[PDB]
Design an enzyme around this catalytic site. Structure first.
Site, PDB file in Angstrom:
ATOM      1  N   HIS A  77     105.447  23.350  15.385  1.00  0.00           N
ATOM      2  CA  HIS A  77     105.790  22.153  16.148  1.00  0.00           C
ATOM      3  C   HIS A  77     104.564  21.274  16.458  1.00  0.00           C
ATOM      4  CE1 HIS A  77     109.610  24.444  16.787  1.00  0.00           C
ATOM      5  NE2 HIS A  77     110.050  23.256  16.415  1.00  0.00           N
ATOM      6  N   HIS A  81     104.906  18.510  11.305  1.00  0.00           N
ATOM      7  CA  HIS A  81     106.359  18.679  11.357  1.00  0.00           C
ATOM      8  C   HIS A  81     107.032  17.360  11.750  1.00  0.00           C
ATOM      9  CE1 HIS A  81     110.377  19.663  12.678  1.00  0.00           C
ATOM     10  NE2 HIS A  81     110.050  19.378  13.926  1.00  0.00           N
ATOM     11  N   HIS A 117     109.959  12.943  18.221  1.00  0.00           N
ATOM     12  CA  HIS A 117     110.975  13.847  18.807  1.00  0.00           C
ATOM     13  C   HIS A 117     110.480  15.207  19.289  1.00  0.00           C
ATOM     14  CE1 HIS A 117     110.932  15.975  14.934  1.00  0.00           C
ATOM     15  NE2 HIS A 117     111.519  16.959  15.592  1.00  0.00           N
ATOM     16  N   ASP A 118     109.240  15.560  18.962  1.00  0.00           N
ATOM     17  CA  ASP A 118     108.661  16.817  19.414  1.00  0.00           C
ATOM     18  C   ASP A 118     107.309  16.609  20.088  1.00  0.00           C
ATOM     19  OD1 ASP A 118     110.552  18.847  18.996  1.00  0.00           O
ATOM     20  OD2 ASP A 118     110.035  19.136  16.904  1.00  0.00           O
ATOM     21  N   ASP A 212     115.231  16.956  10.947  1.00  0.00           N
ATOM     22  CA  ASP A 212     114.471  17.884  11.776  1.00  0.00           C
ATOM     23  C   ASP A 212     114.359  19.228  11.060  1.00  0.00           C
ATOM     24  OD1 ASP A 212     113.058  18.852  13.951  1.00  0.00           O
ATOM     25  OD2 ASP A 212     114.732  18.843  15.353  1.00  0.00           O
ATOM     26  N   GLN A 246     116.316  34.242   8.094  1.00  0.00           N
ATOM     27  CA  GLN A 246     116.455  32.951   7.418  1.00  0.00           C
ATOM     28  C   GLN A 246     117.849  32.736   6.865  1.00  0.00           C
ATOM     29  OE1 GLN A 246     114.069  31.674   9.034  1.00  0.00           O
ATOM     30  NE2 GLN A 246     113.426  30.346   7.328  1.00  0.00           N
TER      31      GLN A 246
HETATM   32  C1  LIG Z   1     110.766  31.780   9.492  1.00  0.00           C
HETATM   33  C2  LIG Z   1     110.612  32.764  10.613  1.00  0.00           C
HETATM   34  C3  LIG Z   1     111.787  32.828  11.554  1.00  0.00           C
HETATM   35  O1  LIG Z   1     112.452  31.587  11.705  1.00  0.00           O
HETATM   36  C4  LIG Z   1     113.660  31.482  12.379  1.00  0.00           C
HETATM   37  C5  LIG Z   1     114.218  32.622  12.961  1.00  0.00           C
HETATM   38  C6  LIG Z   1     115.448  32.554  13.652  1.00  0.00           C
HETATM   39  C7  LIG Z   1     116.161  31.306  13.779  1.00  0.00           C
HETATM   40  S1  LIG Z   1     117.717  31.215  14.683  1.00  0.00           S
HETATM   41  O2  LIG Z   1     118.820  30.522  13.882  1.00  0.00           O
HETATM   42  O3  LIG Z   1     118.151  32.578  14.999  1.00  0.00           O
HETATM   43  N1  LIG Z   1     117.451  30.268  16.041  1.00  0.00           N
HETATM   44  C8  LIG Z   1     117.045  28.944  16.440  1.00  0.00           C
HETATM   45  C9  LIG Z   1     116.918  28.762  17.920  1.00  0.00           C
HETATM   46  N2  LIG Z   1     115.994  29.582  18.487  1.00  0.00           N
HETATM   47  C10 LIG Z   1     114.753  28.946  18.388  1.00  0.00           C
HETATM   48  C11 LIG Z   1     116.296  30.891  18.330  1.00  0.00           C
HETATM   49  C12 LIG Z   1     116.515  31.227  16.840  1.00  0.00           C
HETATM   50  C13 LIG Z   1     115.601  30.221  13.215  1.00  0.00           C
HETATM   51  C14 LIG Z   1     114.307  30.250  12.524  1.00  0.00           C
HETATM   52  C15 LIG Z   1     113.917  28.918  11.911  1.00  0.00           C
HETATM   53  N3  LIG Z   1     114.086  27.823  12.568  1.00  0.00           N
HETATM   54  C16 LIG Z   1     113.827  26.605  12.001  1.00  0.00           C
HETATM   55  C17 LIG Z   1     114.029  25.411  12.921  1.00  0.00           C
HETATM   56  C18 LIG Z   1     112.906  25.247  13.944  1.00  0.00           C
HETATM   57  C19 LIG Z   1     113.374  26.445  10.658  1.00  0.00           C
HETATM   58  I1  LIG Z   1     113.029  24.528   9.764  1.00  0.00           I
HETATM   59  C20 LIG Z   1     113.240  27.659   9.993  1.00  0.00           C
HETATM   60  O4  LIG Z   1     112.815  27.783   8.651  1.00  0.00           O
HETATM   61  N4  LIG Z   1     113.523  28.838  10.617  1.00  0.00           N
HETATM   62 MG   LIG Z   2     112.285  19.661  19.249  1.00  0.00          MG
HETATM   63 ZN   LIG Z   3     111.566  19.252  15.462  1.00  0.00          ZN
END
Ligand SMILES: CCCOc1ccc(S(=O)(=O)N2CCN(C)CC2)cc1-c1nc(CC)c(I)c(=O)[nH]1
Ligand SMILES: [Mg+2]
Ligand SMILES: [Zn+2]
Length: 289
Positions: A77, A81, A117-118, A212, A246
């Site tokens: 973040h 990004h 946005h971040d 995003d 993932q």
């Molecule tokens: C890659 C290492 C682990 O990565 C993840 C693990 C879990 C989940 S989750 O669906 O369970 N969920 C989202 C809300 N919260 C944050 C709790 C967890 C998402 C990710 C992940 N997020 C994003 C968006 C930020 C991207 I772009 C990405 O590739 N991977």
């Molecule tokens: Mg955000």
């Molecule tokens: Zn973002």
């Protein structure tokens, strides 16, 4: 004023030379200055500098301001990004042919929203957050020397500011899950109509989430690298479960969104396609534990 000087002084290569029209775009090899130039090119080809009379030194200073208010110390973040979300917005608008469905003021707001946005994120382990991001966005938009909206009338300005806010707010995944129901439901019945204000705003929210999360759509060597960054933020800041995680994220959150998006515009299909190819790669990995 050092960085500002040579960014203001620089010449800005075309969109084609910069590859900012490709859904498969990546920034790993770009210097900060180069990302700043790419961002200038984005405002320019969406006709934002033209239609709203932005002064070069102000846009440049605004971009350097947005860049500065992201933290390097955060693995995912951060400015890159933010940068990539804005690039994906741009590709969706041009290559994805979404520019045609939206007003100028909306486009202006989506671009600014994607970049902002971040803002000032401190890491997932530190819509409350989103309100704070919009706050950072506003403070910057109102900073002396940085006012890239000064050319807008008061009415245009208020309308743009409200759209920017909804767009940044929309990047709360919680908001996305709550509202996507109505979106998928509409498309399902061939009822989705952009000319309804209410659905228009809903689409802008969905577009925001789509950009995003665009990393999930990238070519496999790129997605793997980015997944590594988000893993660093999730687990170290501050069997391998990641491939399974993932696949879950792709199933729960990503696929339907990109499916719906391509329904709205057939040319956004690459986003959907990259997402599927990536699911395939993560699933194979998951099955080796
Ligand atoms: C890659 C290492 C682990 O990565 C993840 C693990 C879990 C989940 S989750 O669906 O369970 N969920 C989202 C809300 N919260 C944050 C709790 C967890 C998402 C990710 C992940 N997020 C994003 C968006 C930020 C991207 I772009 C990405 O590739 N991977
Ligand atoms: Mg955000
Ligand atoms: Zn973002």
């Amino acid at each position: 004023t050092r960085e500002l000087q040579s960014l203001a002084a620089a010449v800005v290569p075309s969109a084609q030379t910069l590859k900012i029209t490709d859904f498969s775009f990546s920034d790993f090899e770009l210097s900060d200055l180069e990302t700043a130039l790419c961002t200038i090119r984005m405002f320019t080809d969406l006709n934002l500098v033209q239609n709203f009379q932005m002064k070069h030194e102000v846009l440049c200073r605004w971009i350097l301001s947005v860049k500065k208010n992201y933290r390097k110390n955060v693995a995912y973040h951060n400015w890159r990004h933010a940068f990539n979300t804005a690039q994906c917005m741009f590709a969706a608008l041009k290559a994805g042919k979404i520019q045609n469905k939206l007003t100028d003021l909306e486009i202006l707001a989506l671009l600014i929203a994607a970049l902002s946005h971040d803002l000032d994120h401190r890491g997932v382990n530190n819509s409350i957050m989103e309100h704070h991001h919009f706050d950072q966005c506003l403070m910057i938009l109102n900073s002396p020397g940085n006012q890239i909206l000064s050319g807008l009338s008061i009415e245009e300005y208020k309308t743009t500011l409200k759209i920017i806010k909804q767009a940044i707010l929309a990047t709360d995944l919680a908001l996305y899950i709550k509202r996507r129901g109505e979106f998928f439901e509409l498309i399902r019945k061939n009822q989705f109509n952009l000319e309804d204000p209410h659905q228009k705003e809903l689409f802008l929210a969905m577009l925001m989430t789509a950009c995003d999360l665009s990393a999930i759509t990238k070519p496999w060597p790129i997605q793997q690298r980015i997944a590594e960054l988000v893993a660093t933020e999730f687990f170290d800041q501050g069997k391998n479960k990641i491939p399974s995680m993932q696949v879950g994220f792709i199933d729960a959150i990503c696929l339907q969104l990109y499916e719906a998006l391509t329904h709205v515009s057939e040319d956004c299909f690459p986003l959907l396609d990259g997402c599927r190819k990536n699911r395939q790669k993560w699933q194979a990995l998951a099955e080796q534990q």
